[PDB]
Structure 1
């Protein structure tokens, strides 16, 4: 293995846990040589953690509601940010020298181990405001200091969008205008939100299921091998990995 480097994701409940299982399975399918880590909350059932342990190398419990937790004081100032402050613990994983964070609503389509050639903070442009990076996929260097700086910003300013992206863009404010290599190609975080896709979509490495309805919210029908009601192949691939690679794992 590479014990030094990891893909890291986050699950705060059993639903998003299904995303992480598909994500993690997709990274394994494409033969990552890196470690797979999921940050989990106590809202994730013990039974679902057990399933998570079959795909991830580490299942690391984070509970911001605990007074022992580093973020707990910040949560009391900003109680609307529990999920965000949990995600930012990704910077506390100081046993790793470099990590790629990935949202549980991502799916990997090709080997993306070359991301570890990048430096903090490397991320793809967000559609809709492309001078902000999308926080669903980013390369970072674990650090207690950086983590504590991020907590402080969250304390002072909250997030301009109620999630982690605002706060990450505010702290990492030089991304839009400094060093192009920190701009991940859009194909490493391709929002499922048209003629450009016909030309470039085939080279997609990561698809990101941005928005309200997540792939596990759909009703899957084995009879038709698809869901009840743009490029629907990605949603179908999600459920292929789920039914094929994930389902037989704890038995």
Structure 2
């Protein structure tokens, strides 16, 4: 139990808000004892903000922070991710002593309140460059000092990837080489890249997954789902469908717990 600790997510629009709602629903499903917070920006509709208030204990309105870094963003073919600097506001939440930030395209599969035993900055490795942590799940300590240091670093130097992950890795640069306890097990941030790349590892380690991360351009809410049979249509060359269990769980939670609040 912890009144002064929270899970925190971010949505800048109504599309990612569907993700945030499924994430928050999943944290409730697995009996979290912590608070649930969502950072939301003005593009989130008034009606959607009210729906977010049913799942989250706090809906906190913040300003969009945008890197404007088209060079690095287009490099990744993710031109829309400049607005992920808005994550930095999570450090302003000094009403909490410790928080876990989770991307709105994540989904909880088991209680993960034991993340609160960790200290800032604890994160899992990124499969794309595993000496960087993935910033979709991380344990941090709100601080007006750290907040301002990060804003300043972002303003002066920007981010090596145009989003929050580059700047967070640069700021928390000791991660790869210092304090193995700050390496969250990969099962706390299992990104589908690893769901499909080294299938033997998934086969032996994947059932222990605590959090799945639907990293990449096509998000769960972009699929066509049939609730009668519980199937999605898959583009003839779609990776996420290696182990579609996770996407179907996303859609079952959305269909049962969230969609009826929206339409």
TM-score, reference length from structure 2? 0.87
How far has the Cα of 1:85 moved from its partner? 3.1
Asked if residue 195 in structure 1 is aligned to residue 200 in structure 2, the reply is yes
Contact 1:39–1:59 under 8 Å retained in 2: yes
Q: Give the 4+ runs in structure 1 shifted more than 4 A.
A: 65-82
| Structure 1 vs Structure 2 CA RMSD | 4.5
Between 62-71 and 46-55, report the one with greater CA deviation: 62-71
> CA, structure 1 residues 164+42, in 2 after alignment: closer, same or farther (shift >3 Å)?
same
How far has the Cα of 1:3 moved from its partner? 1.5
Structure 2 distance, partners of 1:67, 1:136, is 18
> CA, structure 1 residues 179+109, in 2 after alignment: closer, same or farther (shift >3 Å)?
same
How far has the Cα of 1:157 moved from its partner? 1.4
Contact 1:37–1:58 under 8 Å retained in 2: yes
Structure 2 distance, partners of 1:180, 1:65, is 31
How far has the Cα of 1:38 moved from its partner? 0.1
Structure 1 distance, partners of 2:24, 2:138, is 16
Contact 2:175–2:182 under 8 Å retained in 1: yes
> CA, structure 1 residues 67+166, in 2 after alignment: closer, same or farther (shift >3 Å)?
closer
> CA, structure 1 residues 101+111, in 2 after alignment: closer, same or farther (shift >3 Å)?
same
> CA, structure 1 residues 212+70, in 2 after alignment: closer, same or farther (shift >3 Å)?
closer
> CA, structure 1 residues 141+172, in 2 after alignment: closer, same or farther (shift >3 Å)?
same
Contact 1:188–1:207 under 8 Å retained in 2: yes
> CA, structure 1 residues 28+161, in 2 after alignment: closer, same or farther (shift >3 Å)?
same
> CA, structure 1 residues 73+30, in 2 after alignment: closer, same or farther (shift >3 Å)?
closer
How big is each residue's C-alpha offset from its partner over 1:51-98, in whole Å with a ceiling of 9 and x where there is no partner? 111100000000248999999999999999862332100000000000
1:219 aligns with 224
Aligned residues: 250
Structure 1 distance, partners of 2:162, 2:69, is 21
Structure 1, unpaired ranges of 5+: none
Between 78-87 and 183-192, report the one with greater CA deviation: 78-87
Contact 2:12–2:64 under 8 Å retained in 1: no
How big is each residue's C-alpha offset from its partner over 1:200-234, in whole Å with a ceiling of 9 and x where there is no partner? 00000000001110000101112321111110000
How far has the Cα of 1:7 moved from its partner? 0.1
